[PDB]
Design a protein around this ligand. Structure first.
Ligand SMILES: CCCCCCCCCCCC(=O)SCCNC(=O)CCNC(=O)[C@H](O)C(C)(C)COP(=O)(O)OP(=O)(O)OC[C@H]1O[C@@H](n2cnc3c(N)ncnc32)[C@H](O)[C@@H]1OP(=O)(O)O
Ligand SMILES: CCCCCCCCCCCC(=O)O
Lengths: 337, 339
C-alpha cells in the first residue's frame, strides 16, 4: 500500500446544455412506432432522464484544461509545481500527440514536467492515480495532475441520425442504444507527497482484477459506440464481485466499515445489482447518471468532487473508489479523508 | 539519483511488416503533382533519405501486430503468459478509442484475472514510458514479469494521403503539410521485463531523464488517415530540447558520449539524425539506422532497433546502451541499458 500519497486538490466541470430523454424520445418516436417499440428503455429501465452536452467546438483538451485550472486552485499551487501530468480520457482529439501535451501547453507547464496519456475505458483515472502515486512515493515528483475531459456531442449527433433513418433495424437500434446513456463532463485531481499536505486525504491504492476475454463487448470511437448491453452487465458485475472479494481480503474491507462508495456510473440496474450483491446501503452510494449519464473514466472523480463540494465528508471517513471499464478491467482502492 | 534497481530485460522481439513499398513507386504516383507544383527534387529519397517502408495486410489491426510481437518476446524470455502480471500497450495506432488495445492483446494471449492492463500514449516516446511504469512496479516487487507491447499500422494514412496528394485540386500547402506521412512505416515490438533476481544474466534497465517543451504541441498532429507536420520547426525545436536533456543526462546518468557503446535513437529523417549526431559529437558508427528501408515506426522504433542490434550480435555483456528520442509534444527522453 501507498504510505505517503495524498490528494491535494480536486475539481469537476458539468457540461452546460441539457438533453433530456423525453426530448430524445420525441425524436425517436416515429422509429419506435414502425419498430413497434412500446417501452421507454432510457427513462423507465436505464434510469437516465437527462445528460449534458458541451457547446460546439469544445474539444476534450479544452474540457480537461478547464478542470485542471480548478483543481490547481483547489490545491493552492501554481502550474510550475507540477512534475507530472496524465490525461486519462476516452475522448481524444488526435492519435498524436498526447492530449496531455495539449492540456499541458494550455496550462504552461515547466520543461521538467513529464506528460503522457493513459487509455483504459472507464478505469483509466484510477490507473492514472496509481501511476502517479508510484512516482510520488519514489520521490521523482512532488505534485501531479490527473485530468479527464469527455465529449459526447458527436456521438449523440451521429447516433440520432442513424436511429431516425428509414432503414434502421431493431438490431442496430438495440446495439447503439447504450450510446444514448453517455454524457459530457470533465474532472481533474492534484495528488502530492503527504509531508507537503498533512491535512489532505490519503490515497492508499488498492487491488486490480481483469477479464480481458470480454474485450469485444463494448467498442467505440468519437462518432459511434456499439454495445452488447445484456452480457456486459452480467460479466461486468461478475468481475466487480470478484474484485470486491479480493478487496475485502487485502484492504480489510467490511461493508459496514465503509462510509462512502464512489462507483462508476453506467445504469440503475447495473448499480442496484452490485449493491444488492453485498448488501450495501444505497444511501452511501451517490448517483449522478440520472441527469448526467455515463461520463466514462471521469465519472468516479466527478462524484468524489461533488461529495467534497457538498461538505459531506469528515476526517477519517473511509471511501471506497470502485472503478471498472470495458476490457474488462476492475480496480478498487481506498481513500482516507 | 532514482535510477531503477534490479529491473531487467528478460525477453525482446520485433516483427518486420512483410510488404515493401518503395519511394520509387510512390514518386511514380506523385509525379503529375510534382510537375504541376514545380518540384524537381526527389524529396523522399534524396532529401529525407527514405528508400522503402513496410506495410501490413489491410486487415491487420494494431492489436494483431502487437500480439505477434508479444508471443515472440515470451519465447525469447522462455516464460508462459501465466507469469505476466502487467501488460502495457504503447502504440500510436489503436483499434478503438475504447476499450484499450492492451485489453485486446491481453485477451488474445490469455492473461490471468490478476493481470493489470492499460494503454499508454505519448507519440514516439511511449515505449520508454511503458518501460518506466513497468520498472517501478518491478522494483517494488509488486509483480515478477511485465509485457510492454507496440504494433504500428500506417496502411490507411498511406492510402488516404496518396489519394489527397494526387487530387487535381491539392494545394501546395496541403502537399507540404502531409508529406511527412510518407516517411512512416509499419512494424511491431514487445519486451518482457522482470525482477533481476529471476534472470541474473539478463541486461539491466536503469531508466533515465525526461525534458519537455509542450508549447510546441501543434507541430505534428496525426490521426488514422492523415498526418500534418511542420518539418522545419520540428528539427530546430527538437535539437534545442535534446540539448537540455543531454545536460540532465550528464547529471543523473553520468553520461560521456565516448564512454557509451551504442546509441539507439528514434529517427524521423536522415538529415534530422545527422544534425542530432553532429550536434552532440556522437560517433556515427555507434548509431544504427533502419529508416532508409523501414521509415519511421513511431514508438516501436527504439525497441525495434534494439532488438535488431541484439539479433546482429552487436551487443555484448557490459555494453552501455543509450536509448534516445524526441517525440511530438514536444518530449525528449534518454535512458540507459547495461547489457
Ligand atoms: C465517444 C465516446 C464519448 C466519451 C464518453 C465517455 C464514455 C466512454 C467510456 C465508454 C462507456 C461505455 O462503456 S457504455 C457501456 C455501459 N452502458 C450500457 O450498457 C447501457 C445500457 N444501460 C442499461 O441500463 C441496460 O443494459 C438496459 C436498460 C439496456 C437493459 O436493462 P436490464 O433490466 O436487462 O433490462 P431488461 O429487462 O432486458 O430490459 C427489459 C426491457 O428493456 C428493453 N431493452 C433491454 N435492452 C435494450 C437495448 N440494449 N436496447 C433497446 N431496448 C432494450 C427490452 O426490450 C425490454 O423492453 P420491453 O419488454 O418492456 O418492451
Ligand atoms: C461497479 C458497477 C457494476 C456495474 C458496472 C458494469 C460495468 C459496465 C462496463 C462499462 C464500463 C465503461 O463505461 O467503460
Amino acid at each position: 500500500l501507498f504510505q505517503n500519497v495524498s490528494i491535494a486538490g480536486l475539481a469537476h466541470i458539468d457540461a452546460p446544455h441539457t438533453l433530456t430523454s423525453k426530448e430524445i424520445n420525441e425524436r425517436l418516436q416515429p422509429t419506435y412506432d414502425r419498430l413497434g417499440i412500446k417501452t421507454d428503455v432510457l427513462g423507465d429501465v436505464a434510469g437516465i432522464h437527462a445528460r449534458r452536452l458541451w457547446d460546439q467546438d469544445v474539444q476534450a483538451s479544452d474540457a480537461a484544461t478547464q478542470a485542471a485550472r480548478k483543481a490547481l486552485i483547489d490545491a493552492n499551487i501554481g502550474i510550475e509545481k507540477i512534475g507530472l501530468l496524465i490525461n486519462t480520457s476516452v475522448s481524444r482529439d488526435y492519435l498524436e500527440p498526447s492530449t496531455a501535451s495539449i492540456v499541458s501547453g494550455n496550462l504552461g507547464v515547466s520543461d521538467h514536467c513529464m506528460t503522457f496519456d493513459v487509455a483504459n475505458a472507464s478505469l483509466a483515472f484510477i490507473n492514472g492515480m496509481d501511476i502517479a502515486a508510484r512516482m510520488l512515493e519514489r520521490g521523482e515528483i512532488d505534485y501531479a495532475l490527473v485530468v479527464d475531459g469527455e465529449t459526447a456531442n458527436l456521438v449523440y449527433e451521429k447516433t440520432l441520425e442513424r436511429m431516425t433513418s428509414p432503414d434502421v433495424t431493431e438490431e442496430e437500434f438495440r446495439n447503439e442504444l447504450a450510446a444514448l446513456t453517455l454524457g459530457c463532463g470533465a474532472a481533474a485531481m492534484v495528488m502530492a507527497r503527504s509531508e507537503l499536505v498533512p491535512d489532505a486525504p490519503r490515497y492508499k491504492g488498492g487491488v486490480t482484477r481483469s477479464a480481458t476475454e470480454w474485450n469485444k463487448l463494448c467498442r467505440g470511437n468519437l462518432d459511434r459506440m456499439v454495445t452488447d448491453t445484456r452480457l456486459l452487465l452480467i460479466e461486468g458485475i461478475k468481475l466487480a464481485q470478484k474484485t470486491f472479494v479480493a478487496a475485502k481480503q487485502v484492504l480489510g474491507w467490511a461493508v459496514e466499515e465503509l462510509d462512502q462508495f464512489v462507483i462508476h456510473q453506467v445504469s440503475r440496474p447495473h448499480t442496484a445489482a452490485f449493491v444488492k450483491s453485498f448488501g450495501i446501503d444505497p444511501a452511501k452510494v451517490m448517483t449522478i447518471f440520472g441527469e448526467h449519464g455515463n461520463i466514462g473514466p471521469a465519472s468516479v472523480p466527478i462524484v468524489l468532487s461533488k461529495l467534497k463540494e457538498l461538505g459531506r465528508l469528515k476526517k477519517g471517513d473511509r471511501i471506497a473508489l470502485l472503478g471498472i471499464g470495458s476490457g474488462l478491467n476492475c480496480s478498487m482502492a481506498e481513500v482516507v479523508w
